[PDB]
Design a protein around this ligand. Structure first.
Ligand SMILES: C/C(=C/C=C/[C@@H](C)C(=O)O)[C@H]1CN[C@H](C(=O)O)[C@H]1CC(=O)O
Ligand SMILES: C/C(=C/C=C/[C@@H](C)C(=O)O)[C@H]1CN[C@H](C(=O)O)[C@H]1CC(=O)O
Lengths: 304, 84, 23, 49
């Protein structure tokens, strides 16, 4: 509507983006389809990398983004309704019930009262001391466990599997990266090549749903997969800033008018409205209150 | 015996809520005392959670450019990779 | 168990001693 | 915990450590195949005075 050109959409024959093979230097995907002038405009969301900018021409990026880490929501901890069997296991509960039965059967025949009260005192103090120590240890081992906040915590671990789509920046960005943690990421990608280098974004989503997987993927599509699926989460900030631009052949005379039109659309903020249109659209303690209420209503029922 | 068991469950209730309070405070104090901040120059070059940079190009940046230590050189490469 | 069973054993021995006191 | 070997002081930083200025003790962390000895070299370079 802003330039008056008529256009026809044709699917590329291999269904993949612009990459190259190192065995011959031949590009394939978007770049090979664009150097031979088979198509002119590449509106498909390509990344503005370095070597793909060097080979073929890009417009100005109409929006920016980065790579980030997709993870399963760690919602495995929930007390729920009652469920106080898990803290202070019922072996201890039947032990103290047998102790209460023993003091109840001694209570019929009862200088004796002072020592019975004393042994009851330090028995209850030792029991409550052990329970407070165990609960404090349990809370400080639960609180010292944290989710993987960013890429450094994922670099510290190796048990949770991680990876990205095969080629297309990601690990080819990591081999063009001298950061030692990201060098360890690239060494992991080389060492664990044969399991997690899935090209499809569907199975890269699907491996997070089934397995304990982290998936390195585009920060824009985080919004789409979190609007669709509410069981997923984003961890980490933004690694490095990239963008989505328009792919043109080298020396295309239309490209200057295309980026002037992109800046004209961004002058009024035209992109944001259809971006939002297409892209948006203590209980562990609570049981003892019920226990005290049941005991109070039992005392009320036996009092009358 | 009814007043005795009401007093017993009252002492038990305040006992268990102070027990949970002590466990919560002990966990909070243990996490706070085991938490340590960053002070060394290697404590920023080790992870990517903290980003950093110099004022501009010049004596700050050319010292890390000439870093043969491979400790300032690693953070130099990190800040060089995302100079924008 | 372990510590708790030993505390139970000590409690039973003290109960036996209190019965011996009560005679 | 008390100190047990060089890997425990490799991650440690509150206890400073060093060696002779010029000698053969330098060349263990000048050339090494373990990154912990590189961390001790970083410890020497940060505390060269
Ligand atoms: C998921 C993906 C895979 C690319 C794979 C390689 C082998 C390719 O065909 O260039 C694409 C999606 N669009 C991205 C882009 O080009 O911006 C690219 C991945 C990426 O570069 O972040
Ligand atoms: C035992 C020893 C002691 C230190 C000597 C220094 C203080 C000196 O007089 O230069 C020597 C042995 N040869 C080493 C050297 O090559 O200087 C040095 C030990 C070392 O510092 O590695």
């Amino acid at each position: 509507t802003i330039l008056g050109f008529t256009y026809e959409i044709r699917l590329v024959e291999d269904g993949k983006y612009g990459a190259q093979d190192d065995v011959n230097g031949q590009w394939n995907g978007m770049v090979r389809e664009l150097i031979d002038h088979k198509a002119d405009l590449a509106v498909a969301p390509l990344a503005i990398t370095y070597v793909r900018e060097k080979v073929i021409d890009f417009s100005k990026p109409f929006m920016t983004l980065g790579i980030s880490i997709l993870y399963r929501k760690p919602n495995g901890t929930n007390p729920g309704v009652f469920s106080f069997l898990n803290p202070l296991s019922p072996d201890i509960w039947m032990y103290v019930l047998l102790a209460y039965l023993g003091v109840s059967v001694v209570l019929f025949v009862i200088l004796s009262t002072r020592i019975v009260g004393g042994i009851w005192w330090f028995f209850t103090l030792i029991i409550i001391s052990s329970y407070t120590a165990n609960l404090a240890a349990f809370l400080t081992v639960e609180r010292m466990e944290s989710p993987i906040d960013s890429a450094d915590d994922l670099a510290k671990q190796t048990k949770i599997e991680y990876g990205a789509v095969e080629d297309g920046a990601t690990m080819t960005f990591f081999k063009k990266s001298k950061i030692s943690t990201y060098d360890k990421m690239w060494a992991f990608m080389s060492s664990r090549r044969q399991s997690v280098l899935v090209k499809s974004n569907e199975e890269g989503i699907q491996r997070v749903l089934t397995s304990d997987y982290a998936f390195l993927m585009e920060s824009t599509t985080i919004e789409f997969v979190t609007q669709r699926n509410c069981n997923l989460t984003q961890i980490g900030g933004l690694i490095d800033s990239k963008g989505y631009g328009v792919g043109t052949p080298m020396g295309s005379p239309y490209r200057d008018k295309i980026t002037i039109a992109i800046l004209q659309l961004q002058e009024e903020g035209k992109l944001h409205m259809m971006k939002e249109k297409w892209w948006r659209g203590v209980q562990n303690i609570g049981g003892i209150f019920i226990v005290l209420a049941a005991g109070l209503v039992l005392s009320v029922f036996v009092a009358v």
